[PDB]
Design a binder for this molecule. Structure first.
Ligand SMILES: *Cc1c(COP(=O)(O)O)cnc(C)c1O
Ligand SMILES: *Cc1c(COP(=O)(O)O)cnc(C)c1O
Lengths: 397, 397
């Protein structure tokens, strides 16, 4: 029947479960103390495998705004904004995004995934081109699949191949180059300055996903593009509320004068219910605080550099030579070593992300650490000690 | 550039704005009293254009659970359930859905739109068939577009054409018939009993969307399929939290023994952040209450029948001969009459949905009333009086 196609996935998964102890795909946090600590399998555990970059999820203003919105506006919404009306909160979160990014346009979506799906599939039509890195996020590929444009992959992280591939396309049709500021697998950064120069040379529009940079790259925290001096050169910036902001949602911002027309045409925007009052309230409050969260940003980067430098010094192989983002990736030799290391860390009171094939390329086995602004220096030292102990015990270092 | 393709939509929209007064695509509820009343354009307004069927959005247990979840678990989540872990609330809402539908399987998604997008595109692969009503919801069509299956439209509401179209397909490949219980445009009901018999005759699996029926069709409130005696014959049921439950989210339930494999393959499930604690808490609490919300169900249907019967008696042309759902559709003669009627109602203190081409078929111009369990009999009488007054003033009756 229709599920026979999954027999292979089912068998593969079971083999993988049988070879390990804890199922990394079924981690549950049973109680929570903070953005950095929860109980997992009955043990107080430092959280280092989650995307709460700015530790906004327990911010007292964020929480208060969510509670108040529940009280005053209820648990849900009337339906589609366009068809059934909305609370004023939606206009307010879009204004907050305009203010955050310094743009004339902002459109909020129910998720970051849907923001990418919708914007890519709506902007590029039949006969047009979407040009993207070979290792682009799934949501970006899914937007290409949802649309009717031509797809043009370029070799991962290659300015030269972007240039060559773009230059070989027909000149007249409109083109969307889609880039990510941070490559999330290893935590390295895209050469956006150089790539955007290439895109503009070929007359393409540029969309940059800044999901992994919000509040901590660039003078205003707008992202890698801002840090690299590209203010005013990026046609569209897509992001999410689910990493730095601290709730669900997606958005696209732009200065394009016709940007509002996207609401008229974008099916994933039109055909879904608007976000609940509590969600919009937490997002708006968080976004406004992120504009000036200098202390959080400071701690986030200090913590990231401490962890990166500390692990490097211990002899771990990292995904990056320098600490370039809030993701620190430890590279292991094989599937078993990665699982044993991950398990040792978990058993000792540390949760990190494990990434293995086919989620990563064959031959790449990672422990990915995502730093939080609310990690303390002591916690980062504890983490380093836990890595040292597990790494020695397993034989990684 | 990439937005030149919207020049037509932009011009059309502006012409439509110029011909009316209030923009029906930018309705804002500035303050809220209840599920049935808000301030719109400074006026106390009865809400009859929203999808809050069971009035759960201000239920005191629902609100309390949302507030408590914010306090205890914060505003957001760790990321993807599969990759970054989750709170136990996600397993709990899936259990609530298993209990609600009496199924062995339940998978929650970030939206109903994504549940349809994901399940359709994941279940039916290359060489397989998705068979759907010509007037299917956009999310169902978008799932077809996201997937690589063959698409097979059948004539709207035609058991005979479903049968004929199915019978003419190659026999061996697996097939998904996708049906909606309630046709939301006019508020009529699908002949699911007859259509499911046809699907099974041809060996197809059946997916039914029960977004417009949850808590008020069938002995257990499971949907039109339950009401029509199809318990145990439906392979998959898809729904949303955004109508009856009172928050955002989608789900699919099933008794298929391999249903869990969908998590391994379904990209819109994998590549998005899990729903926030407050959202999951409000959903779980609401779903559990909906299992036994007999009083709400009673009022909802009483209100629907009162409105339908009352409008019919006044001489309005309705989309249905009998009151078959909680959507009552008033059919108007032309674009202008619909707008004038809608505007008169709004100005007088009643908000209903207006649906016109190209959202409806050319020649169909609707005012759609969506009833709430928390409407009072007095409010429904007030609504009838408002329709009578506006209809006379505009010339509809
Ligand atoms: C996180 C992320 C997403 C998904 O955002 P959600 O809000 O979790 O749906 C999509 N694309 C990119 C590049 C991301 O980083
Ligand atoms: C309401 C509805 C949807 C959308 O659900 P959201 O949760 O608002 O995304 C999708 N399909 C059908 C048939 C619906 O009725």
């Amino acid at each position: 029947d229709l599920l026979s196609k999954f027999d292979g996935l089912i068998a593969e998964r079971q083999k993988l479960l049988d070879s390990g102890v804890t199922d990394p795909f079924a981690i549950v946090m049973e109680q929570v103390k903070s953005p950095t600590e929860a109980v997992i399998r009955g043990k107080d555990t430092i959280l280092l495998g989650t995307y709460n970059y700015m530790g906004m999820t327990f911010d007292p203003d964020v929480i208060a705004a969510g509670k108040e919105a529940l009280e005053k506006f209820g648990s849900g919404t009337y339906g589609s904004r366009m068809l059934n009306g909305t609370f004023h909160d939606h206009m307010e979160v879009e204004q907050a995004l305009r203010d955050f990014y310094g743009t004339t346009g902002a459109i909020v979506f129910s998720t970051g995934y849907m923001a990418n799906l919708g914007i890519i599939s709506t902007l590029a039509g039949k006969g047009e081109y979407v040009i993207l890195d070979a290792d682009s996020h799934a949501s970006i590929y899914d937007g290409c699949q949802q649309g009717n444009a031509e797809i043009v992959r370029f070799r991962h992280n290659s300015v030269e191949d972007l240039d060559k591939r773009l230059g070989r396309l027909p000149k007249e049709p409109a083109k969307l180059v889609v880039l990510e500021g941070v490559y999330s697998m290893l935590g390295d950064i895209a050469p956006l300055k150089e790539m955007v120069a290439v895109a503009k040379k070929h007359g393409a529009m540029v969309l940059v996903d800044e999901a992994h940079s919000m509040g901590f790259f660039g003078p205003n925290g707008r992202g890698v593009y801002e840090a690299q001096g590209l203010e005013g050169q990026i046609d569209f910036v897509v992001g999410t509320f689910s990493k730095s902001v601290g709730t669900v949602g997606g958005f696209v911002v732009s200065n394009h004068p016709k940007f509002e027309a996207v609401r008229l045409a974008c099916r994933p925007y039109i055909f879904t219910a608007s976000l609940p009052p509590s969600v919009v309230a937490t997002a708006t409050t968080s976004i406004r605080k992120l504009m000036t969260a200098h202390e959080k940003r400071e701690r986030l980067w200090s913590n990231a550099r401490a962890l990166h430098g500390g692990l490097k010094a211990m002899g771990f192989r990292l995904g990056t030579e320098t600490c370039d983002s809030a993701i620190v990736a430890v590279m292991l030799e094989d599937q078993e070593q990665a699982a044993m290391m991950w398990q040792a860390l978990l058993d000792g009171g540390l949760y990190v992300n494990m990434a293995r094939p086919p989620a990563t390329p064959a031959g790449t086995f990672l422990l990915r650490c995502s730093i939080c602004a609310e990690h303390t220096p002591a916690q980062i030292q504890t983490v380093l000690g836990m890595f040292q102990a597990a790494g020695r015990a397993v034989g990684v270092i």
